[PDB]
């Protein structure tokens, strides 16, 4: 991971980048900020290219669609907590999701949005914005404190609060036991395993395939071939993450690298080609008290 | 003339941000609330610690005195308000009803009602003696930042992140006025003037405004301080010269000439946002309180 570029937020005395994703226009990165703005930056020069007002509180997370036409944002406390933005030509709001504090696109065909409100999953149509489905069963809930509902790669299954749902029938097909307080888990890109905190469960049998202690309290992202997994640990009970992330072999979960940037991390992402890793790093001497973030661009060897 | 407030005491003891300081109406006491879940009582003239009052389960946003200085009400992140007998320190009632953090509270002058405002966007009116919610107002479409009765208790004013101030009939719960100027930045604070003719409203564009709320006219604008993020409490100072007093996010207390709108003093000493200020009912004394990186209360005294 060779450092390639660094930049802080233009015009601002305290730099307030909070999250990032590469845009479809290569060389440009989209960043959310602590004032609810969405900004476009040239990642090599550090030049701010555009700024938009998306939310009345800090942006926590964002996701661009693969075709570059749409963007999901989530804020901290102000409603709407999440929104869908059109990026073709004019930048404008398409839909808003009032109470969903976290949203993702569907994965195969990006025609739906899945939102999370506490223990509950909401599925929306991108065109109409209508709520198509609510997935929640109080008897099966695990009540994960940082529950995030998510589609599997072919969009036919949902993982919500440690419960696996069949989307077409809107039926819970399996509840995974609760072994931590916060993390509800994600699908592996191979479509055949789920990663729920330290537990790798087989979707063919529900057997425990792996125990991966290093994944405790981690959020993860995969490179686009599905061969490497990045993981960074949430800060427990301020920056969302600690100062290190780790790479893992995506097939056997054996560690590859441990990278300690010595600054607390707010977000990271990679480009479609996996040439680059962008990381939001806090320079602040007392973590998020005096938040002062930079974006570092690293070369993926 | 200008006042000459100078620092007399610094009150240390809360272990988190101090959210609100209020002088008892009889002038003897200062009450403070804090993110540390505690209420503390201090001597208003000597700054001497008196007692700690405890029971809330999460941080406290606001505290207020009954007209006879015998009761307190507090508003908490734990979604409740609590009525306290100050001399015994006991919780007399816990007011349950809000569905999210309670940010602001006040007794009416008669002290048989409490009004509260909440992140849940409602204003609620409570029976002091039963602890029961009498009315829930669908007051606003965003979090409510302040609530206050007028001098005869017939009106309630509220302010919200929705950009509006609203005035409510205490008895019926009817909305009687919506104030809005040429823009609607979040309204972070409001209160009636002592004489009940005006309201003083802060907005998160670094601005305070004095309103004739009957005529719906803005009469004075006060600027020069920093206020874009926190809901800072402000005051009319009336014991000496006629001032407007407010905290500021540059860690100063600002004092303005009410009539001329000129800044007449800036009080230096706090090391974090001065989120609360209070004016003594009879002497030229100001209390200020600051956020998590400061944690102290300061008492200031002026000759006018």
Could you explain the architecture of this structure?
The complex is a heterodimer of chains A (301) and B (304). Chain A is mainly beta and 301 residues long. Chain A is built from no helices and 28 strands. In chain A, strand 16 (163-166) and strand 17 (171-175) form a beta hairpin. The N and C termini of chain A lie close together (6 Å). By secondary structure, chain B is mostly beta strands. Chain B has one domain (1-304): 7 Propeller (Methylamine Dehydrogenase, Chain H), CATH 2.130.10. Chain B has no helices and 28 strands.
Please supply descriptive tags for the structure shown above.
heterodimer, A: 301 residues, mainly beta, four-stranded antiparallel sheet, 28 strands, 50% strand, B: mainly beta, Methylamine Dehydrogenase, Chain H, histone H3K4me1 reader activity (chain B), transcription (chain B), WD40_repeat_CS (chain B), histone H3Q5ser reader activity (chain B)
CATH architecture of chain B: 7 Propeller
Q: Please write the string of helix (H) and strand (E) elements of chain B.
A: EEEEEEEEEEEEEEEEEEEEEEEEEEEE
The percent of residues in helical segments of chain A reads: under 10%
Characterize the main sheet of chain A.
4 strands, antiparallel
CATH topology of chain B: Methylamine Dehydrogenase, Chain H
Q: What is the number of strand segments of chain A?
A: 28
Order of strands, main sheet of chain A, comes to: 1-28-27-26
Shape verdict of chain A? globular
- Biggest beta sheet summary of chain B: 4 strands, antiparallel
Q: How far do the termini of chain B sit from each other?
A: 9 Å
Q: How many separate structural domains of chain B?
A: 1
Cross-link (Glycyl lysine isopeptide (Lys-Gly) (interchain with G-Cter in SUMO2)) (chain B): 16
Protein name (chain B): WD repeat-containing protein 5
Modified residues (N6-acetyllysine) (chain B): 82
Site (Important for interaction with histone H3) (chain B): 77, 103, 233, 292
């Amino acid at each position: 991971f060779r450092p390639i570029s660094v930049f802080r937020e233009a015009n601002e005395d305290e730099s307030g980048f909070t999250c990032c994703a590469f845009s479809a226009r290569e060389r440009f990165l989209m960043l959310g900020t602590c004032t609810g703005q969405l900004k476009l930056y040239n990642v090599f020069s550090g030049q701010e290219e555009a700024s938009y007002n998306c939310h009345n509180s800090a942006i926590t997370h964002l996701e661009p669609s693969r075709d570059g036409s749409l963007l999901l944002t989530s804020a901290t406390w102000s409603q709407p907590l999440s929104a869908l933005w059109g990026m073709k030509s004019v930048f404008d709001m398409k839909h808003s999701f009032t109470e969903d504090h976290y949203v993702e696109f569907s994965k195969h065909s990006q025609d739906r949005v899945i939102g999370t409100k506490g223990d509950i999953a909401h599925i929306y149509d991108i065109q109409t914005g209508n709520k198509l489905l609510t997935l929640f069963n109080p008897d099966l809930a695990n009540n994960y404190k940082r529950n995030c509902a998510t589609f599997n790669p072919t969009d036919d299954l949902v993982l919500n609060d440690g419960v696996l749902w069949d989307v077409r029938s809107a039926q819970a097909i399996h509840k995974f036991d609760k072994f931590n307080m916060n993390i509800s888990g994600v699908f592996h890109p191979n479509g055949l395993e789920v990663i729920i905190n330290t537990e790798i469960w087989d979707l063919r049998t529900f057997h425990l395939l792996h125990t991966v202690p290093a994944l405790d309290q981690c959020r993860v992202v995969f490179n686009h071939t599905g061969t490497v997994m990045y993981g960074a640990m949430l800060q427990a009970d301020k920056s969302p993450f600690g100062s290190s992330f780790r790479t893992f072999n995506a097939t056997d979960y054996k560690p590859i690298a441990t990278i300690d940037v010595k600054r607390n991390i707010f977000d990271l992402c990679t480009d479609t080609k996996d040439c680059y890793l962008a990381v939001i790093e806090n320079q602040g001497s007392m973590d998020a008290l005096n938040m002062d973030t930079v974006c570092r661009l690293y070369e993926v060897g | 003339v200008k006042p000459n407030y100078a620092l007399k005491f610094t009150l240390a003891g809360h272990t988190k941000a101090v959210s609100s300081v209020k002088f008892s109406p009889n002038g003897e006491w200062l009450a403070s609330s804090s993110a540390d879940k505690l209420i503390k009582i201090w001597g208003a003239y000597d700054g001497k610690f008196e007692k700690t009052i405890s029971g809330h389960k999460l941080g406290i946003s606001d505290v207020a005195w009954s007209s006879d200085s015998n009761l307190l009400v507090s508003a908490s992140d734990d979604k409740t308000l609590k009525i306290w007998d100050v001399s015994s320190g006991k919780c007399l009632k816990t007011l349950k009803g809000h569905s999210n953090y309670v940010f602001c509270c006040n007794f009416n002058p008669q002290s048989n009602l409490i009004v509260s405002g909440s992140f849940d966007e409602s204003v609620r009116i409570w029976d002091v003696k039963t602890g029961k919610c009498l009315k829930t107002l669908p007051a606003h479409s965003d979090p409510v930042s302040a609530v206050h009765f007028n001098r005869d208790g017939s009106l309630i004013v509220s302010s919200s992140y929705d950009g509006l101030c609203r005035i409510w009939d205490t008895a019926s719960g009817q909305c009687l006025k919506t104030l809005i100027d040429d823009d609607n930045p979040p309204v972070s604070f409001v209160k009636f003037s002592p004489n009940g003719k005006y309201i003083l409203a802060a907005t998160l564009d670094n601005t305070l405004k004095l309103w004739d709320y009957s005529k719906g006219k803005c009469l004075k604008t006060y600027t020069g301080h920093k206020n874009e993020k926190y809901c800072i409490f402000a005051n009319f100072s009336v014991t000496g010269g006629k001032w407007i007093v407010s905290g500021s996010e540059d860690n100063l207390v600002y004092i303005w000439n009410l009539q001329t709108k000129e800044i007449v003093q800036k009080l230096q000493g706090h090391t974090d946002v001065v989120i609360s200020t209070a004016c003594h009912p009879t002497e030229n004394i100001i209390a200020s309180a600051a956020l998590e990186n400061d944690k102290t209360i300061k008492l200031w005294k002026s000759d006018c």
